Amino acid sequence: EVIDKKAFKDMTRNLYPLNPEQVVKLKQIYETSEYAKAATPGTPPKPTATSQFVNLSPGSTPPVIRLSQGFVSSLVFLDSTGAPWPIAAYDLGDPSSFNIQWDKTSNTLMIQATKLYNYGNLAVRLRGLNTPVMLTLIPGQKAVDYRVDLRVQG
């Protein structure tokens, strides 16, 4: 009769090789492992909203946009009064590093960075302007611009 019990215990053991507490601890090591994979090095950048004034003089420096890889930055374009200024066209150098979403009529460009440390520049032509607007795009800083408002002189 003990043959039945011994076969039963070895049988239980073969069928379920892991105890419940072992399931709990294996589950716990696994969550610590994804958290370690998902953790971010250093400090994450500070999310900020900004506002700049754009000078089309031949002495000023072009404006700077701080980006981050995989994050979205929205550029909205306004004139001197503060009304929106719709975009006529744009021209992007290095499209393997940046992604731009744009409906073909509005005044907002939406940019996502694709690479970590590759930086570029971008040209925007408005409806009334003859002078194109040049922006420089720098990713990987200690701050990330979620939305930038640009006041244009005209």
Partner: protein
């Protein structure tokens, strides 16, 4: 007087903005008004060393 803040920095260059809203860009050997001569641009940790002993950083609530 005027206070300058780091807007962006790569190895080699640094883009700075002033409290008057003016924007400049500098390299290793360059002139800065009111601070002196640049001695070292440290792209990591966001520090700029100046000939007068001053260190140029980010704004504290904007960094």
């Amino acid at each position: 007087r005027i206070i300058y803040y780091i807007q962006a920095v790569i190895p080699g260059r640094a883009w700075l903005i002033g409290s008057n809203g003016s924007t400049l860009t500098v390299r290793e050997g360059s002139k800065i008004p009111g601070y002196g001569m640049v001695k070292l641009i440290d792209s990591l940790q966001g520090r700029i060393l100046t000939s007068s002993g001053q260190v140029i950083k980010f704004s504290q609530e904007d960094s």
